[PDB]
Amino acid sequence: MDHLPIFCQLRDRDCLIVGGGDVAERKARLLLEAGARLTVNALTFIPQFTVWANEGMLTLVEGPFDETLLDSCWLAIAATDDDTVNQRVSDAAESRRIFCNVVDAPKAASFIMPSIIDRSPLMVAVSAGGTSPVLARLLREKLESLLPQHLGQVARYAGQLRARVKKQFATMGERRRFWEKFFVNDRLAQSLANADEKAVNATTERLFSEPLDHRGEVVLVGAGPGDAGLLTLKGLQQIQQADIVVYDRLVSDDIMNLVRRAADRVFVGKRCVPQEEINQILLREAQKGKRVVRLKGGDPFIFGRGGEELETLCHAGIPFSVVPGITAASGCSAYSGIPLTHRDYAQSVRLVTGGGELDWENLAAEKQTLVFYMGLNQAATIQEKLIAFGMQADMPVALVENGTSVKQRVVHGVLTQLGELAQQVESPALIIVGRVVALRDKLNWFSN
Amino acid sequence: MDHLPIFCQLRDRDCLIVGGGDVAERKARLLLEAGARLTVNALTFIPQFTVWANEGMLTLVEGPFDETLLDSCWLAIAATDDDTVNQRVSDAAESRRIFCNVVDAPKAASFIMPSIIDRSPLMVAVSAGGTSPVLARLLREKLESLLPQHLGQVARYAGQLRARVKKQFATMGERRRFWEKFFVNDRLAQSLANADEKAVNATTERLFSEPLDHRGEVVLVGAGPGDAGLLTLKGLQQIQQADIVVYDRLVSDDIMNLVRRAADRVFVGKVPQEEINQILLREAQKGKRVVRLKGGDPFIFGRGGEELETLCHAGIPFSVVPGITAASGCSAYSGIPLTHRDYAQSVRLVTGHLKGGELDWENLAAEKQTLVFYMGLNQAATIQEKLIAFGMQADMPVALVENGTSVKQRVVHGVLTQLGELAQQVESPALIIVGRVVALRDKLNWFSNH
Ligand SMILES: Nc1ncnc2c1ncn2[C@@H]1O[C@H](CSCC[C@H](N)C(=O)O)[C@@H](O)[C@H]1O
Ligand SMILES: Nc1ncnc2c1ncn2[C@@H]1O[C@H](CSCC[C@H](N)C(=O)O)[C@@H](O)[C@H]1O
Ligand SMILES: [Cl-]
Ligand SMILES: [Cl-]
């Protein structure tokens, strides 16, 4: 153990920063966030410091380092470019037994500032003693994605329920299992963050009244179009807490590798499976008291039949929520260099599927970006109908297969080639029609 | 934040523990492992303090509390079962500006001792400030299974290489690129764990020999519509690594809280477009990792294309991270699915703000679609008038979602003949949704009613 981590209470304690540039501004913001009573001593200050000074959030002392500014200080930070000044600061702090950090020389003085993940009152700190700040960042990154943004409010509320938990749950083991489902309960975290004090109370007594091993809910999670980096933080957090994950073929294998190892997996994709068995599967797993994640390709509410699955759950009294995902159109647009809107090119974007028939007159109108989902089989018809209803023959068209994935393929041309272009791709694929398609020559940054 | 975590260097620094029982023993063990010069002042001591005193590892002072023992100290710990004594210690420490922990009273005095995961020199500390020891324990145990034990040897080797990296690589960008490759080479980690110095040396020499991509870059990142949990994993990695983040009014404060503290932030709010272009260009040509952070999705009414065209003209590399557009976010969080079993064949994302141009109202009035108007609040009265005049039924359900996905989300709803009036009950940023799917809110709304 090279350093001892301690969590300091800085509120209304005098602290000194020496320096007044960008580096000192970052440290000053951190200490202000911690509630420090801050003096900043520098030869010159960048504008952010004078702003804070007139707002009375700190004190500025312009001029050379004055060691007597340390006389009632609890922490000192030397944040200048000048090794000689930093050494004067760290020597003066050391003689007064004030913990001191030199930003550009972590091993020079008496404390190191770690990477911080703030979920107050819950806090996580990572440091490798100045050996490995890039590693500390890589870990901080990971932890940021894993810790829900509102976990702190849950932690405060947990403190208030401690006495109730121990009187209800006689044993440490039973308590532990309660806390485990308490700290992952989604409606609790969201009710707390929304100040929905009635929803807090309803979730709170469902947690005390339901059987200890029951934690039944359903979360519809949008997996995005393929690239595992396009999952949301919340979607990752939910699949890390699932007892059961129900997924189909349009959820990428890369996404499924992020699923909690101990979660049961139920594949409902087509290896011809109707929708009602899926609705039933979700119903029964949740009634078992399990935490069910329904993982869907893209966004659950865009041609995903997500509403159909939730209506099944609504009458049965099963709590549910929805985590939106990147729909295929947004993902393919970004990864093929084809923005769905651009300047004057398109006043609107239409997301359309390939009883009833498409309004071909409507689809042919100018100033649109058309995006066809599940439309490959209708591709030759789309070419002839658009041409037959007045869309200009030179209108650019593109097809994007397996968008955002490492096997993405993008074919392109003009509308008179559309039916022939669709031959060269297979599902899952998008058809994009409109002037924005021509922008791919400049904006394609991904590799085909 | 409730506390500021700091990692203190205690070697040869005087510390004091008051108390001589099991609690004091556990804190003493930590301070001794950190190299502190430790005095323990207590009326009685459990036997482990004798063993340590006999080995010369600390000093015992048997007796009541001696305030003067704090005189040379950097830290103090009150670890008695006597709350009156503990408060005398914390008062004496306070007067001397000595950080002090009262073990049985986390909210009193001036520092808390966190739970520690040791991968020395790598260390992770976790605490809930006494509010929930169970949460800290559960987190501590999960982080423990997440951090491989090889990490300590990797970090130790990195520390040994730091002098060489500084001498061989002139710029900050080059050194960062070296470290990013160093810390994810699994073979190097295994070779360190096996004490295989030939393999360590071979991989190391190859790593120092690789060229580094000296170029700055611009990443367009979609922040999503507000809820910080809706940022993508890749988007988070971009803003946790960026040198500069250029952001707008429509990027929520909670998203900005995920931008790493070391990045410079540049607010381009109220700034015309080609002035933003100029900022991105200037910073990227200086070799920085630039993120342009935009509300929602960058390629849906974001002007994301114009920015990228300027960079392509200048030879600057760029990429795009899509985000959750306002339509998808407000859909999920208001309980209004954008499509549903032949309620809606089609979704139309439309701007309500054009460059003498006018929308194709015949087209927008078509049946069996969901209309979503972006920046249409000021035009809501005209939208109602035109949709009615081109045949949309007067009772078509409509909803307006203000600050969708945030804790301040407000939803108002009604029928098309109320759209102009409903719009005066909300302010920007708001989305207008028109379509039969709006009626599904009563059965699918899970978020709140504000
Ligand atoms: N990675 C991908 N690349 C191109 N198209 C995709 C795709 N993933 C899904 N799609 C499209 O979506 C259709 C299935 S409908 C499901 C759509 C999904 N809810 C979403 O939001 O994207 C496929 O036929 C295909 O047209
Ligand atoms: N959180 C939010 N709630 C409601 N509407 C929002 C919103 N965030 C953005 N918008 C809408 O988006 C408009 C700006 S245009 C920018 C849209 C963004 N690129 C996206 O993909 O969503 C605003 O006028 C408002 O209509
Ligand atoms: Cl480090
Ligand atoms: Cl705690």
UniProtKB/TrEMBL annotation, chain A:
Active site per UniProt: 248 (proton acceptor), 270 (proton donor)
Span of domain Siroheme synthase central: 119-145
Boundaries of every Tetrapyrrole methylase domain copy: 218-418
Catalytic activity: uroporphyrinogen III + 2 S-adenosyl-L-methionine = precorrin-2 + 2 S-adenosyl-L-homocysteine + H(+); siroheme + 2 H(+) = sirohydrochlorin + Fe(2+); precorrin-2 + NAD(+) = sirohydrochlorin + NADH + 2 H(+)
EC number: 2.1.1.107, 1.3.1.76, 4.99.1.4
Pathway: Porphyrin-containing compound metabolism; siroheme biosynthesis; siroheme from sirohydrochlorin: step 1/1; Porphyrin-containing compound metabolism; siroheme biosynthesis; precorrin-2 from uroporphyrinogen III: step 1/1; Porphyrin-containing compound metabolism; siroheme biosynthesis; sirohydrochlorin from precorrin-2: step 1/1; Cofactor biosynthesis; adenosylcobalamin biosynthesis; sirohydrochlorin from precorrin-2: step 1/1
Keywords, sorted A to Z: Cobalamin biosynthesis, Lyase, Methyltransferase, Multifunctional enzyme, NAD, Oxidoreductase, Phosphoprotein, Porphyrin biosynthesis, S-adenosyl-L-methionine, Transferase
Region (Precorrin-2 dehydrogenase / sirohydrochlorin ferrochelatase): 1-204
Molecular function per GO: NAD binding; precorrin-2 dehydrogenase activity; sirohydrochlorin ferrochelatase activity; uroporphyrin-III C-methyltransferase activity
Family: In the N-terminal section; belongs to the precorrin-2 dehydrogenase / sirohydrochlorin ferrochelatase family.
Known function: Then it catalyzes the NAD-dependent ring dehydrogenation of precorrin-2 to yield sirohydrochlorin. Finally, it catalyzes the ferrochelation of sirohydrochlorin to yield siroheme.
Name of the protein described by the UniProt record: Siroheme synthase
